Design a protein around this ligand. Structure first.
Ligand SMILES: [Mg+2]
Ligand SMILES: [Mg+2]
Ligand SMILES: [Mg+2]
Ligand SMILES: [Mg+2]
Ligand SMILES: [Mg+2]
Ligand SMILES: [Mg+2]
Lengths: 123, 118, 205
RNA sequence: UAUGAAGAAGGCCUUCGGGUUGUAAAGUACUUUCAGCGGGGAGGAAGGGAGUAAAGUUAAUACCUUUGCUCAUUGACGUUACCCGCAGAAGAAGCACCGGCUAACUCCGUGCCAGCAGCCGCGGUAAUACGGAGGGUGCAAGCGUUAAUCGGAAUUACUGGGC
């Protein structure tokens, strides 16, 4: 409060921590799927959410979510992951980019197609 | 071959002997007209308020030629027909927006004709 | 870079008809005014606050076919320029070559007059300009290209120009097929239904 | 580009009467930007060289060097900037969103399933929130997602906070 006290100890600019530390301030990072399994959502919801454990190039080991219906993913699959946490899945902070590398596009996608790596359907 | 237009204006020449109904656009270009004399009425019949209404019925043409719909109303002249004609426009399916009198009233201008001693 | 869909849909949308289509055939006949498009259009939509601001901005843009990116650059210039920004922005939009040609009477529609500019049919001060976004400067003389005059569409557009109260700041020439952009336009001449202060706040958010 | 209304059909909804797509289309006039092709055509170009004649410069003004001039000059881009003719709408529109925030909605499918999800949260059999359809909103040769910086954040407050 007092200016003399503030002169003695100046204001300290707090550093804001990222929500995606494993990305190291990079938009996407490629990785290898260490494990494919299923997990359960939080409290107000009930489903069988599809998640994957993936080892990134920088050594970080994290679990990423699959936002598309159906996936041809298994051991040693190379996927591209982006930021974005799952509200109902604690510890899941990344999404698998559908339609990139060895991750196929979502079948029958017609709306928000660019968000799932699905080529435009022929007229 | 012609053009179409809306938002017209109707000029009403209510003379003591005849009634002149002319529908025109905002810029004074005439679209159609009808008169009591041209509606089968001569002599006294050419001035009665009724016949003036009938003249409007004729003016109900130009519909396809010009979808005026809403139109302005200009009224000049003290002759009978300052009321009748106006109704006929409503009953014809038109939107009367404003009604104003445009009767020429000189401020002691030209000398008028002498009185009819009869 | 240009809208290519149906036009009466937008016209009935936003609401008040504002300088679209040839302008001869009655606008009401071609469509159904006072009814937004869509299956659910026949209802009263309780507009919001964001809603009103958005509609006005969208309306203004369509009247002059200016895309957001383009329109935003006009707003930045208008704020930079001295004076009241909203009228300055309106002046800049009216000063575009394609709009000026439409008001000069060489095009039936702003889109067609814009196409006339685009199709290399307009001469400015002895120099060929086919850019719709060209800024006309005061005292300039705009003259239809010799070859262009042979287009009968231009001739018919002149005829219709009579109905639109000839803009004061534009000296139109009939047979001379020329025009003199006397000076910048003023708020009064422009449609009084535009609330420029709404535009200023919306982009200043 | 304009005209173009049995508001064509078809699509979807339907209070089964209709509406909606949408004057959108088709059709009918009209025009040919650029891209197609063809034919012209600046500017970047200043230069030095060769000569000349005079001047300064000399023992000789030889040597030069300064003028002026004279002839011939050089462009990588480059089939240039641009101009002119050719033909025919012909060759050129997607993307995201429509539960609130936040502009923009129903129908079908599904039934705490599958799923969405920036926040609030949806879905458990009449889902404006998922999936599909129509329709609509935003932006546009780009639209979205993600990452990052500031803002909003008076939320480290000196301006500009509190105990
Ligand atoms: Mg652009
Ligand atoms: Mg070309
Ligand atoms: Mg809304
Ligand atoms: Mg961010
Ligand atoms: Mg602060
Ligand atoms: Mg406090």
């Amino acid at each position: 409060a007092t200016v003399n006290q503030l002169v003695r100890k100046p204001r300290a600019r707090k550093v804001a921590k990222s929500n995606v530390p494993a990305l190291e301030a990079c938009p996407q990072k490629r990785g290898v799927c260490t494990r494919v399994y299923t997990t359960t959502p939080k409290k107000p919801n009930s489903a069988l959410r599809k998640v994957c454990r993936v080892r990134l190039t920088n050594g970080f080991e994290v679990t990423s979510y699959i936002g598309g219906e159906g996936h041809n993913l298994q051991e040693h699959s190379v996927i591209l992951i982006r930021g974005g946490r799952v509200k109902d899945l604690p510890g899941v902070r990344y999404h698998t980019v559908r339609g990139a590398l060895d991750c196929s596009g979502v079948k029958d996608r017609k709306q928000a197609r660019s968000k799932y790596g699905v080529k435009r359907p022929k007229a | 071959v012609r053009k179409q237009v809306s938002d017209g204006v109707a000029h009403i020449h209510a003379s003591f002997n005849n009634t002149i109904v002319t529908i025109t656009d905002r810029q004074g270009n005439a679209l159609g007209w009808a008169t009591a004399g041209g509606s089968g009425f001569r002599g006294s019949r050419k001035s009665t308020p009724f016949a003036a209404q009938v003249a409007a019925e004729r003016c109900a043409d130009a519909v396809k030629e010009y979808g005026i719909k809403n139109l302005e109303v200009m009224v000049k002249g003290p002759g009978p027909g300052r009321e009748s004609t106006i109704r006929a426009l409503n009953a014809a399916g038109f939107r009367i927006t404003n009604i104003t009198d445009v009767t020429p009233i000189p401020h002691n201008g030209c000398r008028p004709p002498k009185k009819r001693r009869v | 870079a240009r809208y290519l869909g149906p036009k009466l849909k937008l016209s009935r949308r936003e609401g008040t008809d504002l300088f679209l289509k040839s302008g001869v055939r009655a606008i009401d006949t071609k469509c159904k005014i006072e009814q937004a498009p869509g299956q659910h259009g026949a209802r009263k939509p309780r507009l919001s606050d964001y809603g009103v601001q958005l509609r006005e901005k969208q309306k203004v843009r369509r009247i002059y076919g200016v895309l957001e990116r383009q329109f935003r650059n006009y707003y930045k210039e208008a704020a930079r320029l001295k004076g009241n920004t909203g009228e300055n922005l309106l002046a800049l939009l009216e000063g575009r070559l394609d709009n000026v040609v439409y008001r000069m009477g060489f095009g039936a529609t702003r889109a067609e007059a814009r196409q006339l500019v685009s199709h290399k049919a307009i001469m400015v001060n002895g120099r060929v300009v086919n850019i719709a976004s060209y800024q006309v400067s005061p005292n300039d003389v705009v003259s239809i290209r010799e070859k262009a005059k042979k287009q009968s569409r231009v001739k018919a557009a002149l005829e219709l120009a009579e109905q639109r109260e000839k803009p004061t700041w534009l000296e139109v020439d009939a047979g001379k097929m020329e025009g003199t952009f006397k000076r910048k336009p003023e708020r009064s001449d422009l449609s009084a239904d535009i609330n420029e202060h709404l535009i200023v706040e919306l982009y200043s958010k």
